[PDB]
Amino acid sequence: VQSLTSDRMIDFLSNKEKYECVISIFHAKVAQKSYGNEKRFFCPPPCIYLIGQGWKLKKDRVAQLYKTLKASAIHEQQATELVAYIGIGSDTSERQQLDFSTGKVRHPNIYDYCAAKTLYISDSDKRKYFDLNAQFFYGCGMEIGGFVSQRIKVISKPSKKDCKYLCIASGTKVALFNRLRSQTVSTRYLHVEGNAFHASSTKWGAFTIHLFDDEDNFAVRDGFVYYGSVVKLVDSVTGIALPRLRIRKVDKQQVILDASCSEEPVSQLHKCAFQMIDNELVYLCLSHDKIIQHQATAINEHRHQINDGAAWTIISTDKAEYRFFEAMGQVANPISPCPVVGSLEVDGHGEASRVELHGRDFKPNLKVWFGATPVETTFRSEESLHCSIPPVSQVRNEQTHWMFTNRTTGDVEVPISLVRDDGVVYSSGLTFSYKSLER
């Protein structure tokens, strides 16, 4: 029993950075089946990012365990390696291996990232959907966990001329990528590094694609993105965005744009470009691994000629992010069923107060912690937990004051957490506040 102690928790909650373990998995929301014996690699490719510096500490918590557990009488540098295998609704595929090896050449706050670009589903797999399967563990046969992504649809080929899996939705996430004539090596994906856009060869970014409505801050509506609609592309991580843009259709390097197109919803894996709002001749383009505007030629009134790398394939992508930290030394078991808190609700008054959490993979073995204050958690579904708000008095002390005490509105907002009755914190990232009328 390695239960969590108020004190230990503080040590964490205080320096999450020097502790926490983030691991995110980006992927496509639709994959193209491969026929017979060919292999049609998923694209973009599902890649896993290892975030935080706790991944280093996580190493040591084992490095000083393989040796400090050896005790008796070159195989060391091996018992600290990151072994990971990603796989699909595998039934006949071995389950591809991601690198993560210490002997890898590089070519911000990202411990290490790997991409699985060999994945593919055969027609022999007669399932309509399927989800990714990732297993992480250490060289020294030490476990970590096992995850699965959101569902992924299987498509025979991208239609030329359900609907939330075949149309892009107003508030969803996508990736925009460019390719060149029957080959791969030249694949670029719209991404954002250090507060700025460009076009990676290495990785791709997930961008929430908003449907502009009207009026920094702006109006966004609900509705499938239709060709010729003002679209706002926001990066999901950083926050950064691109100027207003009018997504538009394109066929064979030609920006097809008559009136009978605003009756066409942007299908998956189709190509298209974003023409500026003012100079309806300019298109968002990249001229060699760096994005810029561009004045492409005019041809008729119902069409337009654009540059090669000015028209890309849009595709809805999703992602998952797992945050976890070992309160007390690695645990015997793994993490695998890792809870993901969606939204936090509250209803009732003072003595009848109640907090509703929503999410996925909720195991009854979890206790919610308002900051450093555990509560009599109630598991209902593995999608929800109710819990009674603890009395303010018993949350922050002369020590926990500056951290739980909102430096702004002098209120008291504490970080919510889901805890494993085995000393492990699963940070919801949400926060409970207490309306305080002092100062």
Partner: protein, 297 residues
């Protein structure tokens, strides 16, 4: 303003082209417990907003005037409201006074509050109508009362921040008024089998339908009301293609499993990843259930 359109703030970046001292005494009082003082005029209330952007009634509503100050609240409200008041102003968390009201379940205060031209409808940060909250903390009356404004019944189907409706939230919580709080809504003007359709559109809200939620870790009283009253096709699938049975089977509620089975709910059909009730129950190790399936056909 509606749920369909929101306000998204975010930075930006442009691509080149070529290379070459206040603490409102009135409020604290109102907040406090008993002490009613200071002028309660048009300038008193209506105009004043702190750091929570809460108006007097907001704090008055906050029946949290603990230490007990019973009936005065209803009155101390009626005051600032009859001395003029934006009976529909929103606080930090987009909560109309009338809401904080249903939150604290001050049905009386509400009653007047509405009469003062207050709109329940106006949902908060949690894209939740007033009726949701009623359901949120299952206060039967509180809703049976509010279900008299024409405009409210209008937003009967509207779904919250987690894409759930009236019953949806009802069926989700158990109790004895519940099964009636339901009979109410259905009587009021709500279809039993509503999946989120008016929303299949963008906003990623969708899937299930009442029965699902009940099914999902028991609430028998309702699954019985729904599959027994009339309707609810136990064979419906959410955006993950799940039959309540499944949901049930997944979570592990043998109790519900059996009823559904008994009523003729298909066990054939599979989810999105070609799985099925057993494989599910089986997958999460709910043998009790597993065997119940093999004990069938």
């Amino acid at each position: 303003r509606t749920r369909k359109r929101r306000m998204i703030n975010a930075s930006v970046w442009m691509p080149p082209m070529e290379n070459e001292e206040s603490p409102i005494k009135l409020h604290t009082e109102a907040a406090g417990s008993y002490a009613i003082t200071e002028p309660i005029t048009r300038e008193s209330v209506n105009i004043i907003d702190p750091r929570h952007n809460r108006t007097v009634l907001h704090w008055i509503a906050s029946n949290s005037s603990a230490e007990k100050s019973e009936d005065l609240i209803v009155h101390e409200a009626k005051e600032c409201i009859a001395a003029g008041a934006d009976v529909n102003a929103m606080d930090c968390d987009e909560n109309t006074p009338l809401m904080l009201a249903v939150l604290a379940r001050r049905r009386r205060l509400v009653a007047y509050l509405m009469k003062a031209g207050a709109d329940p409808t106006i949902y908060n940060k949690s894209e939740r109508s007033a009726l949701h909250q009623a359901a949120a903390n299952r206060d039967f009356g509180m809703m049976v009362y509010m279900l008299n404004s024409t405009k409210l019944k209008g937003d009967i189907e509207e779904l919250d921040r987690n894409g759930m409706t009236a019953l949806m939230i009802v069926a989700h919580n158990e109790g004895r008024d519940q099964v009636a709080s339901a009979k109410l809504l259905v009587e009021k003007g709500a279809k039993v089998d509503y999946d989120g359709a008016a929303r299949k559109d963008s906003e990623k809200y969708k899937g299930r339908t009442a029965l699902h939620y009940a099914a999902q870790v028991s609430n028998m009283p309702i699954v019985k009301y729904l599959v027994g009253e009339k309707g609810s096709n136990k064979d419906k699938q959410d955006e993950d293609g799940k039959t309540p049975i499944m949901l049930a089977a997944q979570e592990g509620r043998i109790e519900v499993v059996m009823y559904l089975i008994q009523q003729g709910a298909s066990v054939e059909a599979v989810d999105a990843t070609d799985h099925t009730a057993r494989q599910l129950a089986q997958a999460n190790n709910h043998h009790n259930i597993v065997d119940i399936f093999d004990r069938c056909r």
